[PDB]
């Protein structure tokens, strides 16, 4: 199938309490492999997955230096944006950046990304063409202009279409036994009477990968999506994910309910019934 590499940067200012906290994490699909944290003792880009550990010292010194150059850029960017929105010097603000590339089953480049946010909302984003930008407001318009005069997009595109996919393919090869796999979900149902007239039916999905999944409750074949409660997919901590969907059914009608699970792993959509 297709694969992706994605990095996430978060810079949180903290006036008076020192320089802003910078955190970066790298991912290949749904598996993290590196991380940098300014509030950590190492002050180095560190490994978060066994397979990235085969990279020599020069790799780590490079990532550290280049990711530190990034904290430097974000540190001052935090200041100018504060200006753009005429915000006080004592407030805490955050800049988030996400960027990466997707490749298909043959390792070919499909698309690249680069999107930035300020205080939890979109600020500016590189368009699919990797040649133009989309500013969310008048402030980002100031940045859009500066970024055009500097031909910033060209630099981004060169990376997204070059080293981004080159290294994405490399990681997929170096950690093939762990990255190129799909763990189908293990499923079971639970039952909780809410009263003598109602009961909760919860459908579970455990130890699956990738994280993307679909859980649905049907009654007599009829889709019940609206009375169904779903929790956010969550990580088990071992590289697999979990998730459940629940539904409140009249005491005595549970036999009519069916849970359907859809995942890239399982050859065919599963179907669970109470009893």
């Amino acid at each position: 199938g297709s694969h992706s590499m994605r990095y996430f940067y978060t810079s949180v200012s903290r006036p008076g309490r020192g320089e802003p906290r910078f955190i970066a994490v790298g991912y290949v699909d749904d598996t993290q492999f590196v991380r940098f944290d300014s509030d950590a003792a190492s002050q180095r880009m560190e490994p978060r997955a066994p397979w990235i550990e085969q990279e020599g010292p020069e790799y780590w010194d490079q990532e550290t230096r280049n990711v530190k150059a990034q904290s430097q850029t974000d540190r001052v960017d935090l200041g100018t944006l504060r200006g753009y929105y005429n915000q006080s010097e004592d407030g805490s603000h955050t800049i988030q950046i996400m960027y990466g590339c997707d490749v298909g089953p043959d390792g070919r480049f499909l698309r690249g990304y680069r999107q930035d946010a300020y205080d939890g909302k979109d600020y500016i984003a590189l368009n699919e063409d990797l040649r133009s930008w989309t500013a969310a407001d008048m402030a980002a318009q100031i940045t859009k202009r500066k970024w055009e005069a500097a031909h910033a997009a060209e630099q981004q595109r060169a990376y997204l279409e070059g080293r981004c996919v080159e290294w994405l393919r490399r990681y997929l090869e170096n950690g093939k036994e762990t990255l190129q796999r799909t763990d189908p979900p293990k499923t079971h149902m639970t039952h909780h009477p809410i009263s003598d007239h109602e009961a909760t039916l919860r459908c579970w999905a455990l130890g699956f990968y990738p994280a993307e999944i679909t859980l649905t409750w049907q009654r007599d074949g009829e889709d019940q999506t609206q009375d169904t409660e779903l929790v956010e997919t969550r990580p088990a901590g071992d590289g697999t994910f979990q998730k459940w969907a629940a539904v409140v059914v009249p005491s005595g009608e549970e036999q009519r309910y069916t849970c359907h699970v859809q995942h890239e792993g399982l050859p065919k959509p599963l179907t669970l019934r109470w009893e």
């Binding site: 990532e63 960017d77 500066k146 970024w147």
Partner: peptide
Amino acid sequence: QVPLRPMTYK
């Protein structure tokens, strides 16, 4: 691998 250099200042 992250970019060799950060993006132009905002």
